[PDB]
Design an enzyme around this catalytic site. Sequence first.
Site, PDB file in Angstrom:
ATOM      1  N   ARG A  57       0.841  -1.182   0.000  1.00 15.12           N
ATOM      2  CA  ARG A  57       0.000   0.000   0.000  1.00 15.12           C
ATOM      3  C   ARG A  57       0.881   1.238   0.000  1.00 15.12           C
ATOM      4  NH1 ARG A  57      -3.579  -1.592   3.404  1.00 15.12           N
ATOM      5  NH2 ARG A  57      -3.021  -0.508   5.356  1.00 15.12           N
ATOM      6  N   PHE A  62       1.333  10.608   1.885  1.00 11.76           N
ATOM      7  CA  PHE A  62       0.992  10.025   3.155  1.00 11.76           C
ATOM      8  C   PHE A  62       2.101   9.043   3.566  1.00 11.76           C
ATOM      9  CE2 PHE A  62      -2.607   7.313   5.300  1.00 11.76           C
ATOM     10  CZ  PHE A  62      -2.003   7.459   6.526  1.00 11.76           C
ATOM     11  N   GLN A  65       3.627   1.460   2.908  1.00 10.85           N
ATOM     12  CA  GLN A  65       3.506   0.394   3.889  1.00 10.85           C
ATOM     13  C   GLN A  65       4.004  -0.913   3.283  1.00 10.85           C
ATOM     14  OE1 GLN A  65      -0.138   0.279   6.103  1.00 10.85           O
ATOM     15  NE2 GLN A  65       0.153  -1.823   6.817  1.00 10.85           N
ATOM     16  N   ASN A 104      -0.035  -1.563  12.942  1.00 10.88           N
ATOM     17  CA  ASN A 104      -0.660  -2.350  13.982  1.00 10.88           C
ATOM     18  C   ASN A 104      -2.163  -2.447  13.793  1.00 10.88           C
ATOM     19  OD1 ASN A 104      -2.044  -0.348  15.577  1.00 10.88           O
ATOM     20  ND2 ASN A 104      -0.005   0.367  16.155  1.00 10.88           N
ATOM     21  N   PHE A 115       5.602   1.218   8.167  1.00  9.29           N
ATOM     22  CA  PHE A 115       5.381   2.223   7.149  1.00  9.29           C
ATOM     23  C   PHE A 115       6.463   3.269   7.209  1.00  9.29           C
ATOM     24  CE2 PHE A 115       3.234   5.607   9.710  1.00  9.29           C
ATOM     25  CZ  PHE A 115       2.926   4.888  10.826  1.00  9.29           C
ATOM     26  N   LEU A 124      -1.071   9.963  14.143  1.00  7.63           N
ATOM     27  CA  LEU A 124      -0.654   8.623  14.508  1.00  7.63           C
ATOM     28  C   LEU A 124       0.202   8.616  15.768  1.00  7.63           C
ATOM     29  CD1 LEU A 124       0.070   7.241  10.920  1.00  7.63           C
ATOM     30  CD2 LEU A 124      -2.033   7.085  12.238  1.00  7.63           C
ATOM     31  N   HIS A 128       1.130   4.523  17.028  1.00  9.24           N
ATOM     32  CA  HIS A 128       2.073   3.717  16.261  1.00  9.24           C
ATOM     33  C   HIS A 128       3.458   4.053  16.797  1.00  9.24           C
ATOM     34  CE1 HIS A 128      -0.793   2.360  13.201  1.00  9.24           C
ATOM     35  NE2 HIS A 128      -1.424   3.441  13.578  1.00  9.24           N
TER      36      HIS A 128
HETATM   37  C1  LIG Z   1      -3.996   0.703  10.294  1.00  8.46           C
HETATM   38  C2  LIG Z   1      -2.916  -0.164   9.605  1.00  8.46           C
HETATM   39  N1  LIG Z   1      -2.950  -1.522  10.116  1.00  8.46           N
HETATM   40  C3  LIG Z   1      -2.734  -2.639   9.373  1.00  8.46           C
HETATM   41  O1  LIG Z   1      -2.462  -2.516   8.165  1.00  8.46           O
HETATM   42  C4  LIG Z   1      -3.000  -3.889  10.103  1.00  8.46           C
HETATM   43  C5  LIG Z   1      -1.897  -4.947   9.849  1.00  8.46           C
HETATM   44  C6  LIG Z   1      -2.327  -6.286  10.560  1.00  8.46           C
HETATM   45  C7  LIG Z   1      -1.526  -7.488  10.142  1.00  8.46           C
HETATM   46  N2  LIG Z   1      -1.953  -8.666  10.927  1.00  8.46           N
HETATM   47  N3  LIG Z   1      -4.384  -4.394   9.697  1.00  8.46           N
HETATM   48  C8  LIG Z   1      -5.517  -3.941  10.362  1.00  8.46           C
HETATM   49  O2  LIG Z   1      -5.362  -3.084  11.347  1.00  8.46           O
HETATM   50  C9  LIG Z   1      -6.849  -4.204   9.843  1.00  8.46           C
HETATM   51  C10 LIG Z   1      -6.947  -3.472   8.574  1.00  8.46           C
HETATM   52  C11 LIG Z   1      -6.625  -2.116   8.370  1.00  8.46           C
HETATM   53  C12 LIG Z   1      -6.570  -1.373   7.102  1.00  8.46           C
HETATM   54  C13 LIG Z   1      -6.726  -1.853   5.760  1.00  8.46           C
HETATM   55  C14 LIG Z   1      -6.642  -1.021   4.594  1.00  8.46           C
HETATM   56  C15 LIG Z   1      -6.380   0.376   4.823  1.00  8.46           C
HETATM   57  C16 LIG Z   1      -6.277   1.355   3.794  1.00  8.46           C
HETATM   58  C17 LIG Z   1      -5.899   2.645   4.093  1.00  8.46           C
HETATM   59  C18 LIG Z   1      -5.699   3.022   5.447  1.00  8.46           C
HETATM   60  N4  LIG Z   1      -5.911   2.106   6.422  1.00  8.46           N
HETATM   61  C19 LIG Z   1      -6.183   0.815   6.143  1.00  8.46           C
HETATM   62  C20 LIG Z   1      -6.283  -0.049   7.219  1.00  8.46           C
HETATM   63  C21 LIG Z   1      -5.259   4.340   5.855  1.00  8.46           C
HETATM   64  C22 LIG Z   1      -6.392   5.181   6.470  1.00  8.46           C
HETATM   65  N5  LIG Z   1      -4.174   4.220   6.870  1.00  8.46           N
HETATM   66  C23 LIG Z   1      -3.079   3.465   6.682  1.00  8.46           C
HETATM   67  O3  LIG Z   1      -2.872   2.914   5.586  1.00  8.46           O
HETATM   68  C24 LIG Z   1      -2.232   3.244   7.868  1.00  8.46           C
HETATM   69  C25 LIG Z   1      -0.977   4.085   7.906  1.00  8.46           C
HETATM   70  C26 LIG Z   1      -0.100   3.658   9.096  1.00  8.46           C
HETATM   71  C27 LIG Z   1       0.112   2.203   9.103  1.00  8.46           C
HETATM   72  N6  LIG Z   1      -1.165   1.448   8.983  1.00  8.46           N
HETATM   73  N7  LIG Z   1      -1.959   1.790   7.875  1.00  8.46           N
HETATM   74  C28 LIG Z   1      -1.598   0.503   9.818  1.00  8.46           C
HETATM   75  O4  LIG Z   1      -0.953   0.197  10.808  1.00  8.46           O
HETATM   76  C29 LIG Z   1      -7.152  -5.755   9.477  1.00  8.46           C
HETATM   77  O5  LIG Z   1      -6.967  -6.421  10.716  1.00  8.46           O
HETATM   78  C30 LIG Z   1      -7.877  -5.979  11.822  1.00  8.46           C
HETATM   79  O6  LIG Z   1      -7.925  -4.490  12.022  1.00  8.46           O
HETATM   80  C31 LIG Z   1      -7.972  -3.735  10.821  1.00  8.46           C
END
Ligand SMILES: C[C@@H]1NC(=O)[C@H](CCCN)NC(=O)C2(/C=C/c3ccc4ccc(nc4c3)[C@@H](C)NC(=O)[C@@H]3CCCN(N3)C1=O)COCOC2
Length: 167
Positions: A57, A62, A65, A104, A115, A124, A128
């Site tokens: 992603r 932004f 990841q 997370n 990320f 965040l 995080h």
């Molecule tokens: C919220 C996300 N968490 C995950 O990806 C986790 C990983 C779990 C692996 N077992 N996975 C998760 O937390 C879950 C999915 C989250 C998800 C999926 C697709 C997404 C598309 C876009 C976004 N957020 C997204 C978040 C935007 C708003 N934010 C982010 O991409 C952030 C940026 C900072 C890093 N990050 N993602 C995360 O930590 C799936 O597992 C249960 O809780 C939600």
Amino acid sequence: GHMVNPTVFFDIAVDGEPLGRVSFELFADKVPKTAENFRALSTGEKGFGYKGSCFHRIIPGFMCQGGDFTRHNGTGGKSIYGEKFEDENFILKHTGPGILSMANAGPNTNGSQFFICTAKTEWLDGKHVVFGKVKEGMNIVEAMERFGSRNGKTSKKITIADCGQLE
Ligand SMILES: C[C@@H]1NC(=O)[C@H](CCCN)NC(=O)C2(/C=C/c3ccc4ccc(nc4c3)[C@@H](C)NC(=O)[C@@H]3CCCN(N3)C1=O)COCOC2
Ligand SMILES: [Cl-]
């Protein structure tokens, strides 16, 4: 002697073509458990880790990841500790481009996913764990960023072709 914060590198490829190297300082002085996880996953020394994994992603302006080396899509990943691990602290903040921080799914759920910020992401802070920063090759992250999109799907396959620990 004194612990020296580790430097790790990723050699990034785009549809299998070399792009360049990003190196990171890992703040083992502040977040030792978190730094060590990422360091070991970068060397592969436990028998698993980041080499060959993708950035699943990428949202321009932004963050990028990655770290899901088991399922390649954000649903997988694992730490070196046999279980997700705790949030060590939130000493370090998401101050701007180049910050390296843990993905997370709730409190105390750190695995392998991480990320790299390409903007300040202060909302965040405190949820995080920030554990490193780009040292060299922020230009390479900016190049990666161009292959992302609004919804985060990448237009080319962005991989960690090689990774490890520098002097
Ligand atoms: C919220 C996300 N968490 C995950 O990806 C986790 C990983 C779990 C692996 N077992 N996975 C998760 O937390 C879950 C999915 C989250 C998800 C999926 C697709 C997404 C598309 C876009 C976004 N957020 C997204 C978040 C935007 C708003 N934010 C982010 O991409 C952030 C940026 C900072 C890093 N990050 N993602 C995360 O930590 C799936 O597992 C249960 O809780 C939600
Ligand atoms: Cl994970």
